[PDB]
């Protein structure tokens, strides 16, 4: 089936109108030897049949709703009011607002998005969002290297391993150096920063769920003339001292925690907030308030001149677009919960996490890894292989024990809890783990 409206009569008139003998004639100037190849694709299907097939594939999976898996993605409540609103056709089907006069809905929401992000980070400004947390980190780091004119980077191993991988790829692309600060005791020790370093990167909460006082890290970086980049989960900023309060120059993170469906790691949007002082080097889109010809308040994409300041030297960047829709869902979420609602969701998640921690620690052979204090995620050392445990758990109907790369230690498994987990759910999981071990 197809979506074209053309009736055969209309197709005839149009072909005659452009001087074509047929649809095939439209491609007559292309090289004949490669036209209409015998491509193999399954035969077309009516929409209902496509849904049946989609449902059958979904039935092959074990849903992860209320899962205990963590490490960048968690099963939080996805408020239907946010999803209903982001489903409005005007938001779903619009494109980059290059014509501001008919795009005030998108331009204003983006403005509100930037201010909410800058507040959560305790910083002055923020762009209209990045693809995800990892790309946001890469871009934030390049901003720093550009600002200081340096090419050296120090990153804590506590930073999400995939984030460090995306970062390595970008740094390798622009010709920069990356040094990884190994974690000891689950935290990152204060490093001695050389003048070749333009950026120091630390995550809080840790990838293993550990809280880290970033204050001294920022000092260590400024003392060497380097910039400090903080990677923080937006949801945790609801109750944790923000990077801005620590004196961080740049703050990045992933927005999946802000009510976005997990969608197998798909749904994301990265945030990037910094000081107005570095706005020339700020990548991505920027929406500014302004006024129309008769004084009405309006919003519009601004400061595109930045494209020049960003490519004038080393550590170039080329962000062409953002993650508008998902960033919009984030803003709707932040606006739906407010300062207190966000704080509550964060605390509940931390509470159920700490309670789960104490429960799992009772299983024989199970020892803690992540030190105190930690947030809503934690790593435990298991007596069996974590990948084997996760599978055993899955076979029992539970999703847990997200495997930690062994660069952090052997037999380590991450666990996360959210506001939708209850006392009874933790006990269930513990039981299961008990029997698995």
């Amino acid at each position: 089936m197809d979506y074209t409206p053309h009736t055969e009569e209309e197709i005839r008139e149009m072909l005659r109108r452009v001087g074509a003998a047929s649809l095939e004639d439209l491609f007559a100037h292309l090289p004949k030897e490669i036209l209409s190849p015998p491509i193999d694709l399954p035969e077309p299907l009516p929409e209902w049949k496509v849904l049946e097939e989609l449902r059958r594939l979904a039935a092959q999976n074990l849903p992860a709703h209320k899962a205990f898996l963590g490490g960048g993605v968690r099963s939080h409540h996805v408020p239907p009011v946010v999803q209903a609103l982001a489903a409005r056709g005007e938001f779903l089907t619009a494109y980059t607002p290059y014509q501001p006069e008919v795009s005030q809905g998108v331009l204003q929401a983006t403005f509100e998005y930037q201010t909410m992000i800058a507040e959560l980070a305790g910083l002055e400004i923020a762009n209209a969002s990045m693809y995800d947390g990892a790309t946001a980190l890469a871009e934030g780091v390049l901003l720093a290297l550009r600002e200081t004119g340096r090419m050296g980077v120090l990153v804590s191993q506590g930073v999400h391993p995939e984030y460090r991988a995306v970062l390595r790829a970008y740094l390798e692309a622009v010709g920069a150096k990356l040094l990884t600060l190994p974690l000891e005791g689950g935290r990152t020790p204060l490093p001695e920063v050389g003048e070749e370093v333009g950026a120091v990167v630390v995550q809080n909460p840790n990838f293993l769920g550990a809280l880290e006082d970033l204050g001294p890290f920022a000092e260590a970086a400024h003392g060497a003339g380097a910039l400090f980049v903080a990677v923080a989960d937006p949801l945790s900023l609801g109750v944790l001292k923000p990077p801005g309060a620590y004196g961080a120059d740049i703050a990045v993170g992933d927005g999946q925690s802000l009510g976005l469906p997990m969608g197998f790691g798909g749904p994301h949007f990265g945030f990037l907030a910094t000081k107005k002082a570095f706005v020339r080097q700020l990548p991505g889109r920027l929406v500014s308030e302004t006024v129309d010809v008769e004084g009405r308040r309006g919003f519009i994409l601004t400061l595109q001149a930045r494209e020049q300041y960003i490519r004038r030297a080393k550590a170039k960047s080329n962000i062409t677009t953002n993650a508008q829709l998902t960033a919009l869902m984030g803003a709707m979420y932040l606006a739906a919960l407010g300062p207190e609602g966000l704080r509550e969701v964060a605390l509940k998640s931390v509470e159920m996490a700490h309670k789960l921690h104490a429960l799992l620690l009772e299983v024989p052979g199970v020892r803690p890894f992540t030190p105190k204090p930690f947030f809503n995620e934690f790593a435990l050392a298991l007596p069996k292989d974590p990948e084997a445990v996760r599978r055993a758990l899955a076979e029992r109907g539970f999703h847990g024990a997200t495997p930690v790369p062994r660069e952090y230690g052997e037999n380590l498994a991450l666990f996360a809890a959210t506001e939708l987990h209850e006392e009874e759910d933790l006990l269930a999981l513990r039981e299961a783990l008990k029997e698995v071990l």
């Binding site: 009011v81 494109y95 798909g266 062409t320």
Partner: protein, 471 residues
């Protein structure tokens, strides 16, 4: 006049309440780690939230409400069916036992196979995001290839046509390459003499869109490929204009080694106001080993994520890509099949070729007008600024096409109607474009008038920027 969400809030007002018994911070987190001052987030009830965003949506347009002839964006209808499809896979975690996510993995694998068949590629990554992300991925792959063959220090040049989108050279240049611009002929196609003169062992790759940015198919593409292979130059395919040839021609058969696709363009994934999107990258056998990791493979035991790629360039973004977008693309392809995609391309080209004739009859000029494909570039007659004509369109209830691009055509109007727009809609649009040329100069330079806001002070926005509510 429309209130900001921050103006709608009231001290202490609550919206969503997801916690029954809220715990005390001091009992879970040490004092020194606690936020001192709350973030100044909005404090609004749910009704207000709905009033605010519904109201904002009513101050916005999309494919769902307006004709969007945006050149090089392929603003086609986004079937509502795909949104239903997407929610079917919302409750999946990337780190759950892959043995329990075979449906998602299988879908990713099948989409992989489909995209490869339409593209003539041997391997593919579905990981990269929208924008230039996939573009960067493909370039890095070309660099890895040369570096591995030991010519990394000599293959230092990337060639782009004068009509290329600034994105192409910006990405190459960001990857450490020196970019050389190649002029096109009087017809707007690649000048073969200029290219031959320019090719050599120093050139890493040639980046092209086919059809090109003028909407013209590069008729000598097979010669260009032969020339590039002779010089060991990798032919890179910017897939922005794939919509014109789906099913009629495979980029692979034209000699392209790497293909950058855009699901949010050619395969109906919604544009969502800028994103998110998906930019898969297809590759010929000799480049497959450098694909970013991981790739989705099929074994006798089942589908799995393959990370064991010793020559891989690494990871370019988190997890495995925009999975929900992949789902949508999959649904689309399984709906139309080869014949549906082939027909879509044909009608996308017919709509553009037909609308071009209508615009030329309305008094517009077409600097490069060989047989038109999915798009074309027009110019207003002398004396009119595309900028003004665009604003008048806004007043007339239509959305303007891409403006001021490609750069080689002054006052350019890049028009791409896509296959889903009706014949009478193309005519209505043409009528509007024509009526504007008859409007007095002042009426035009001061449009719009009825839109939620009129022409905006872009200067104040640049010299006196206010980036946040609390600025």
């Amino acid at each position: 006049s429309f209130p900001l969400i921050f103006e709608r809030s009231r001290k202490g007002r609550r919206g969503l309440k997801l916690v029954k018994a809220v715990p005390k911070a001091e009992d879970l987190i040490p004092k020194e780690h606690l936020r001192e001052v709350p973030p100044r987030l909005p404090e609004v009830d749910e009704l207000t939230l709905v009033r605010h965003y519904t109201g904002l949506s009513r101050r916005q347009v999309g494919v769902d409400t307006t004709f969007y002839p945006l050149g090089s964006c392929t603003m086609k209808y986004n079937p509502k069916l795909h949104e239903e499809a997407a929610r079917l896979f919302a409750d999946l975690h990337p780190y759950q036992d892959p043995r329990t996510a075979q449906g998602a993995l299988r879908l990713m694998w099948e989409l992989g196979e489909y995209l490869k068949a339409l593209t003539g590629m041997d391997a593919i990554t579905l990981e990269p995001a929208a924008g230039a992300h996939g573009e960067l991925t493909g370039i890095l792959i070309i660099r890895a290839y040369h570096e591995d063959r030991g010519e990394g220090r000599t293959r230092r040049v990337v060639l782009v046509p004068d009509s290329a989108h600034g994105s192409n050279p910006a990405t190459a240049s960001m990857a450490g390459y020196q970019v050389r611009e190649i002029p096109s002929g009087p017809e707007g196609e690649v000048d073969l003499e200029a290219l031959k003169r320019e090719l050599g062992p120093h050139v890493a790759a040639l980046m092209l869109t086919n059809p090109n940015t003028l909407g013209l198919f590069e008729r000598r593409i097979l010669e260009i490929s032969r020339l590039c292979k002779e010089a060991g130059v990798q032919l890179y395919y910017d897939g922005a204009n794939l919509n014109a040839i789906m099913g009629w021609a495979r980029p692979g058969d034209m000699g392209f080694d790497v293909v950058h696709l855009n699901l949010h363009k050619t395969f109906t994934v919604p544009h969502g106001g800028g994103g998110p999107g998906s930019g898969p990258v297809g590759v010929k056998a000799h480049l497959a080993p450098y694909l970013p990791v991981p790739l989705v493979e099929r074994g006798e035991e089942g589908f799995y994520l393959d990370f064991d790629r010793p020559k891989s360039i690494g990871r370019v973004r988190s997890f495995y890509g925009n999975f929900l977008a992949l789902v949508r693309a999959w649904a689309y392809i399984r709906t139309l099949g080869l014949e549906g995609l082939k027909k879509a391309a044909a009608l996308a080209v017919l709509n553009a070729r037909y609308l071009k004739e209508l615009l030329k009859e309305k008094g517009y000029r077409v600097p490069y007008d060989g047989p038109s494909m999915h798009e074309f570039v027009a110019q207003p007659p002398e004396g009119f600024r595309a900028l003004d004509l665009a604003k008048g369109l806004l007043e007339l209830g239509f959305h303007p096409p891409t403006v001021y691009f490609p750069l080689i055509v002054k006052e350019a109007l890049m028009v791409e109607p896509t296959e889903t727009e009706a014949k009478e809609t193309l005519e209505a649009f043409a009528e509007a474009m024509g009526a504007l040329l008859k409007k007095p100069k002042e009426w035009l330079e001061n449009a719009p008038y009825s839109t939620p806001v009129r022409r905006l002070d872009e200067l104040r926005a640049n010299k006196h920027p206010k980036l946040t509510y609390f600025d």
